[PDB]
Design a protein around this ligand. Structure first.
Ligand SMILES: [Zn+2]
Length: 53
C-alpha cells in the first residue's frame, strides 16, 4: 500500500517503510504510531491520502 501527504505532496510507501521515524518495511498505514505525522510538513497521518488500495 502506498500513501501520500495531501498537504505537501510527500509520500509513504508501506513497502519501503519509514525506518527514519521507526517504521519497518512492511508496516501498515493504520498500523503506524498514533503520533505518526508527516516527516515533512508535520501533518498527522490524518492528512495522508491513499493512492487507492
Ligand atoms: Zn506533508
Amino acid at each position: 500500500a502506498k500513501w501520500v501527504c495531501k498537504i505537501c505532496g510527500y509520500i509513504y510507501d508501506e513497502d519501503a517503510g519509514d525506518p527514519d521515524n521507526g517504521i519497518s518495511p512492511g508496516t501498515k498505514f493504520e498500523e503506524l504510531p498514533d503520533d505518526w505525522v508527516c516527516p515533512i510538513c508535520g501533518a498527522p497521518k490524518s492528512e495522508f491520502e491513499k493512492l487507492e488500495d
